[PDB]
Amino acid sequence: ADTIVAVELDTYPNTDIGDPSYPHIGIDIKSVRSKKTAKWNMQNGKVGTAHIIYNSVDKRLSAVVSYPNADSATVSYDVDLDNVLPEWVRVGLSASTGLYKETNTILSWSFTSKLKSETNALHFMFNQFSKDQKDLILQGDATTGTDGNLELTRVSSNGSPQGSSVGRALFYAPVHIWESSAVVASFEATFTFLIKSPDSHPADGIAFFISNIDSSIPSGSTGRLLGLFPDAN
Amino acid sequence: ADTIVAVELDTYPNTDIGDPSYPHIGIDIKSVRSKKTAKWNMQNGKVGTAHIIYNSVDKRLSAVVSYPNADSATVSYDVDLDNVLPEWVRVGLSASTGLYKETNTILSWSFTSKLKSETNALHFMFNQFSKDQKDLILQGDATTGTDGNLELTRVSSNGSPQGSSVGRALFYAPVHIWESSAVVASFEATFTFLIKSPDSHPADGIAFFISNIDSSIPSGSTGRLLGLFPDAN
Amino acid sequence: ADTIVAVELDTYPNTDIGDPSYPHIGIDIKSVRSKKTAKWNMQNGKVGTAHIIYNSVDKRLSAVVSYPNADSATVSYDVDLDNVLPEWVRVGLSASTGLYKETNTILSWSFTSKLKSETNALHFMFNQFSKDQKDLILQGDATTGTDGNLELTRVSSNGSPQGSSVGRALFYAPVHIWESSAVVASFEATFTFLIKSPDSHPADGIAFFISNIDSSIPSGSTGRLLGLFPDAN
Amino acid sequence: ADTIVAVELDTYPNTDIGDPSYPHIGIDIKSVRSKKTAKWNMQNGKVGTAHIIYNSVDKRLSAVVSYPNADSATVSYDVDLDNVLPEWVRVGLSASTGLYKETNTILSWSFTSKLKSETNALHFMFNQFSKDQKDLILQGDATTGTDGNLELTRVSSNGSPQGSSVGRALFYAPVHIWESSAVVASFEATFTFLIKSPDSHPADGIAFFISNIDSSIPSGSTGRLLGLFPDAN
DNA sequence: ATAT
DNA sequence: ATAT
DNA sequence: ATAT
DNA sequence: ATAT
Ligand SMILES: *OCCCCCCNc1c(NCCOCCO[C@H]2O[C@H](CO)[C@@H](O)[C@H](O)[C@@H]2O)c(=O)c1=O
Ligand SMILES: *OCCCCCCNc1c(NCCOCCO[C@H]2O[C@H](CO)[C@@H](O)[C@H](O)[C@@H]2O)c(=O)c1=O
Ligand SMILES: O=c1c(NCCCCCCO)c(NCCOCCO[C@H]2O[C@H](CO)[C@@H](O)[C@H](O)[C@@H]2O)c1=O
Ligand SMILES: O=c1c(NCCCCCCO)c(NCCOCCO[C@H]2O[C@H](CO)[C@@H](O)[C@H](O)[C@@H]2O)c1=O
Ligand SMILES: [Ca+2]
Ligand SMILES: [Ca+2]
Ligand SMILES: [Ca+2]
Ligand SMILES: [Ca+2]
Ligand SMILES: [Mn+2]
Ligand SMILES: [Mn+2]
Ligand SMILES: [Mn+2]
Ligand SMILES: [Mn+2]
Numbered sequence: 039a040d041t042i043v044a045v046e047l048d049t050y051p052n053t054d055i056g057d058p059s060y061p062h063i064g065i066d067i068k069s070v071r072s073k074k075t076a077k078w079n080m081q082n083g084k085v086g087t088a089h090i091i092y093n094s095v096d097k098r099l100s101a102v103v104s105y106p107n108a109d110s111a112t113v114s115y116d117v118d119l120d121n122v123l124p125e126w127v128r129v130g131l132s133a134s135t136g137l138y139k140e141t142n143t144i145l146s147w148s149f150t151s152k153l154k155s156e157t158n159a160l161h162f163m164f165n166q167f168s169k170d171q172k173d174l175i176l177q178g179d180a181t182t183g184t185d186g187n188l189e190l191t192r193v194s195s196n197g198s199p200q201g202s203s204v205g206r207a208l209f210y211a212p213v214h215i216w217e218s219s220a221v222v223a224s225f226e227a228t229f230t231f232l233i234k235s236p237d238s239h240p241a242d243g244i245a246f247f248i249s250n251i252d253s254s255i256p257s258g259s260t261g262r263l264l265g266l267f268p269d270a271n
Numbered sequence: 272a273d274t275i276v277a278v279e280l281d282t283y284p285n286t287d288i289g290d291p292s293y294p295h296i297g298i299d300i301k302s303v304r305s306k307k308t309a310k311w312n313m314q315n316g317k318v319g320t321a322h323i324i325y326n327s328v329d330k331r332l333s334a335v336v337s338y339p340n341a342d343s344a345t346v347s348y349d350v351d352l353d354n355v356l357p358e359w360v361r362v363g364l365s366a367s368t369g370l371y372k373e374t375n376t377i378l379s380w381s382f383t384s385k386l387k388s389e390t391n392a393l394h395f396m397f398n399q400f401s402k403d404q405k406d407l408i409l410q411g412d413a414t415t416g417t418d419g420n421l422e423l424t425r426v427s428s429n430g431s432p433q434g435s436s437v438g439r440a441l442f443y444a445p446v447h448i449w450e451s452s453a454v455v456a457s458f459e460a461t462f463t464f465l466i467k468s469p470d471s472h473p474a475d476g477i478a479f480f481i482s483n484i485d486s487s488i489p490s491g492s493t494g495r496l497l498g499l500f501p502d503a504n
Numbered sequence: 505a506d507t508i509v510a511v512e513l514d515t516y517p518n519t520d521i522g523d524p525s526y527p528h529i530g531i532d533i534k535s536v537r538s539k540k541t542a543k544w545n546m547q548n549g550k551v552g553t554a555h556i557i558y559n560s561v562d563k564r565l566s567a568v569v570s571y572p573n574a575d576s577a578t579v580s581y582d583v584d585l586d587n588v589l590p591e592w593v594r595v596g597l598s599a600s601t602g603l604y605k606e607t608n609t610i611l612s613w614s615f616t617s618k619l620k621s622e623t624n625a626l627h628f629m630f631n632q633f634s635k636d637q638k639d640l641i642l643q644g645d646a647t648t649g650t651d652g653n654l655e656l657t658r659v660s661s662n663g664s665p666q667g668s669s670v671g672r673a674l675f676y677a678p679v680h681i682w683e684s685s686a687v688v689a690s691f692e693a694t695f696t697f698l699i700k701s702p703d704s705h706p707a708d709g710i711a712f713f714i715s716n717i718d719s720s721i722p723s724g725s726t727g728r729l730l731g732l733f734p735d736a737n
Numbered sequence: 738a739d740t741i742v743a744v745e746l747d748t749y750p751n752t753d754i755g756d757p758s759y760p761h762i763g764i765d766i767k768s769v770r771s772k773k774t775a776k777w778n779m780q781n782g783k784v785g786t787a788h789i790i791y792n793s794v795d796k797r798l799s800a801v802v803s804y805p806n807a808d809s810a811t812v813s814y815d816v817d818l819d820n821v822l823p824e825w826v827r828v829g830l831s832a833s834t835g836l837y838k839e840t841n842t843i844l845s846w847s848f849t850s851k852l853k854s855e856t857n858a859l860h861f862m863f864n865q866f867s868k869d870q871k872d873l874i875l876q877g878d879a880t881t882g883t884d885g886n887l888e889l890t891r892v893s894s895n896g897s898p899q900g901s902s903v904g905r906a907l908f909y910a911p912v913h914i915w916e917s918s919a920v921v922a923s924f925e926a927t928f929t930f931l932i933k934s935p936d937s938h939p940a941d942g943i944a945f946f947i948s949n950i951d952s953s954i955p956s957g958s959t960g961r962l963l964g965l966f967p968d969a970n
Numbered sequence: 971a972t973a974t
Numbered sequence: 975a976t977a978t
Numbered sequence: 979a980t981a982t
Numbered sequence: 983a984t985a986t
Contacts, residue, residue: 087920089794089921091792091795091923093790095788095790096795096797096813100792100794100795102794102921104920114794126403137983154788155398155399156398157398158399159395160395161393161395162394162444166389170359172359172445172484173393173445173446173447186389210443210445211443212405212443217401219399224790251405284979322561324559324561326566328557329557329566333559333561335561335687335688387553387555387694454555454576455557455568472979592871621865623862623864624862624863625862626861627858627859627860627861628858628860629856629858630857631857632918638825638911638913639913676910676911677872677909679872680867680872704971938975
């Protein structure tokens with residue numbers, strides 16, 4: 039199977055697989071069962087911002103998820119990603135729906151990685167996604183160009199989201215996530231998202247993830263698996 | 272054939288194909304016969320710096336090449352790259368040798384591209400090249416990892432450059448070089464290089480280039496063709 | 505008197521002092537009488553974007569001004585700023601009103617300057633202005649904090665722009681704009697602005713400027729003098 | 738007195754004031770008596786790199802100090818700088834000598850601060866310091882321009898360092914270090930340094946510091962006080 | 971930019 | 975490096 | 979770039 | 983929202 043590190047914005051509690059009984063953000067290390075979660079007051083139909091940060095000095099993966107008129111949710115986990123990820127990775131966004139549904143609309147995405155050894159750097163910023171975006175690998179249901187946005191999961195022409203959908207967007211270039219020689223390795227990711235449901239239970243969520251370079255949507259990974267994992271282990 | 276725009280650091284005069292009688296820098300638009308050249312005092316065995324700049328406002332491709340404690344060489348050509356290049360490109364470095372030879376050593380390479388529509392940006396910086404550099408596509412004789420450098424052309428075990436060699440390195444991700452709705456599109460590239468010849472007459476040169484995404488070394492493009500062009504037309 | 509280089513967004517034709525008979529952008533080198541102008545369709549009450557660029561290779565000061573869903577206005581002038589400005593400068597925004605008036609609201613301002621000798625760089629970005637913004641020098645009627653915006657000219661309690669007003673904001677740190685040993689010197693500025701007039705004939709305009717470090721609003725430089733020049737010579 | 742937060746590279750143990758019995762790096766919060774220290778193998782006459790990082794999510798001030806052929810030293814302290822520093826600060830480098838001496842040579846210094854609320858940013862980079870550097874406030878013995886370096890303390894023409902010297906360099910612009918509205922505030926500082934002594938005990942060290950905007954070298958603050966503190970409390 |  |  |  |  040793939041190697042996954044992710045930050046999940048989990049809109050739907052799957053009590054049976056160890057989610058808390060509320061919408062939550064979490065840190066996923068090689069399992070959909072988050073090593074750490076925080077309660078998240080997801081605002082149906084509002085544009086939110088996710089900020090993800092890590093550096094090889096603190097070795098602490100942290101995320102903040104926020105809306106304009108509101109308190110942030112934040113979650114952190116101490117993990118040495120040198121011991122988890124391969125040296126070279128792809129970075130991506132992933133989203134899914136199951137019996138329940140939501141738009142998994144990405145309005146912007148930026149990423150920066152640095153190896154300060156003589157610094158190697160990578161930075162990309164998408165504030166507009168276009169119809170034939172050749173620096174993105176789209177997987178499953180993911181599409182670009184609709185209002186300059188990335189729709190990770192299936193949405194109708196009138197803006198109605200579909201169930202049993204899964205989709206991912208990976209940056210085309212492999213990323214040098216860690217290097218043994220590096221004295222400082224850091225990365226940060228920012229995305230803006232619009233999660234909207236007619237349902238009283240939106241599902242299932244959006245994740246920022248880092249994977250082996252050849253990562254693909256695992257078979258059946260709609261619903262609670264967020265397009266990331268082959269099972270709930 | 273491929274579409275090529277390039278800045279050549281041409282160490283060897285091929286007067287036969289319209290090079291001036293001296294080492295020169297030039298702007299190449301779909302031909303090895305430069306639309307503009309400037310005289311270049313290439314310093315055998317010294318580390319030089321090439322700076323390349325373009326924006327959609329002035330539509331002027333400019334380059335400056337320098338060594339510490341010496342006058343720069345500079346060349347500029349008015350060209351609308353929207354009318355020359357496809358919307359999506361790859362960017363790369365290329366070098367060749369023929370009957371005469373030189374190290375075509377790259378010590379660092381950086382690149383930035385920006386579309387201000389809401390700005391999309393791409394930036395990479397290599398100050399160290401590693402043995403298995405997965406964000407580079409190496410073509411022909413190009414290798415990485417030797418002293419943390421990119422050797423565009425074949426260098427022997429004893430450090431001797433070889434004749435009739437050609438090699439290129441392209442950044443793995445396609446680049447959105449122009450867009451109809453962009454109000455400002457800009458790019459810049461910087462690389463540092465070490466050209467050393469144990470004989471007199473070094474040959475043949477190093478180029479920064481922009482190509483169609485699927486660009487490959489034209490067969491036989493050693494010597495005066497700089498790994499860029501299938502012929503000297 | 506001060507040394508001024510500016511890009512004017514001139515909303516009011518002063519044909520008396522050589523303005524064209526229409527709202528225009530221009531390049532001002534030590535005179536309010538622009539060395540080059542382009543026609544500008546200023547959109548009353550809309551948020552616009554000004555982009556300004558210069559490098560020591562082309563020695564061409566260029567500006568583009570745009571609104572969403574409209575054609576840009578662009579203006580360029582060949583000028584060696586090494587021969588005009590002192591080595592160290594301050595950069596700023598300036599605006600004025602006279603018998604006629606307009607809001608001269610700035611929503612965002614960014615600036616980057618680079619001397620590649622070993623690169624020295626300065627970059628600031630304001631997307632929000634605060635009430636006590638200690639990295640800005642406010643001159644004349646300029647205020648910050650009103651809706652997180654910079655109001656270059658006086659606006660009444662009921663939001664009405666006032667006549668005979670002039671105001672400027674300079675970045676607190678002096679900027680190394682050129683250096684003899686630099687092989688490449690470059691700068692760019694971006695600002696977003698909202699010009700609104702409740703009457704017809706808005707006046708008088710907004711400028712990005714570069715000045716001697718100790719620059720101050722010339723006394724009486726309201727109206728057509730744009731807070732930049734002591735007279736119309 | 739001033740408010741100080743600093744990272745000290747402390748070359749000289751002052752056992753009487755709570756230094757450990759070896760050259761150390763430490764985190765100083767409003768006292769020369771470090772809240773946390775780590776052992777530091779200072780390499781007399783070699784160029785080192787100091788990296789300092791903080792963000793408002795982890796609220797952990799961390800530093801790494803390294804030389805090319807060697808293991809790094811790293812030190813971290815959990816501290817909410819919102820509760821320690823004023824909202825607006827200056828950032829600087831400081832160094833001192835006493836009975837014992839060392840060159841306190843700074844070869845490069847960079848700084849970035851961001852308030853992600855709509856992001857406000859500041860970035861400067863000095864790879865060359867010039868004789869009349871108007872974006873630096875030099876205090877005490879500090880001088881620029883000698884080989885493009887910043888000498889924080891007195892050095893003779895032949896490169897011999899003097900005792901009882903103290904000097905600081907502050908960036909001219911005030912820095913917005915924290916903001917109540919900000920969802921993420923981050924900063925990072927990098928400097929390259931050359932500490933060289935003929936003595937077997939070099940003294941006294943180099944600090945990166947953040948202070949009230951009007952910070953000045955306290956009276957008598959040579960030797961163990963590093964130009965930062967009025968006393969050893 | 972529209973009016974005398 | 976010198977003082978207890 | 980220097981030699982025939 | 984339905985199953986125990
Ligand atoms: O400051 C400039 C120095 C002057 C150099 C003058 C040229 N010297 C020279 C020539 N001229 C004919 C060019 O072709 C000769 C060989 O061609 C092969 O080698 C070159 C270099 O690798 C390459 O560009 C060609 O494509 C081909 O591979 C001589 O014959 C001679 O000597
Ligand atoms: O699309 C452009 C619209 C056409 C405007 C034509 C001018 N209208 C106009 C003039 N012309 C003379 C200019 O001076 C009049 C008043 O001058 C004062 O006000 C302006 C604006 O604040 C300022 O630039 C001057 O410096 C002075 O303060 C009229 O008299 C009239 O109406
Ligand atoms: O806390 C838990 C609930 N409550 C939600 C039930 C809906 C209430 C509002 C409608 O009346 C559950 N339910 C059991 C989990 O299984 C739900 C169905 O699973 C599918 O759908 C979800 C959402 O798309 C996916 O996560 C899942 O993979 C399945 O496809 C709790 O545990
Ligand atoms: O661990 C401690 C030492 N050892 C160093 C003594 C020199 C050994 C090599 C020479 O033979 C000390 N010494 C006592 C501390 O006082 C030293 C003198 O203080 C002045 O000089 C230092 C260095 O510039 C300053 O820090 C201080 O402020 C005074 O100006 C230990 O505690
Ligand atoms: Ca879930
Ligand atoms: Ca040639
Ligand atoms: Ca005017
Ligand atoms: Ca000490
Ligand atoms: Mn979960
Ligand atoms: Mn040529
Ligand atoms: Mn004008
Ligand atoms: Mn100490």
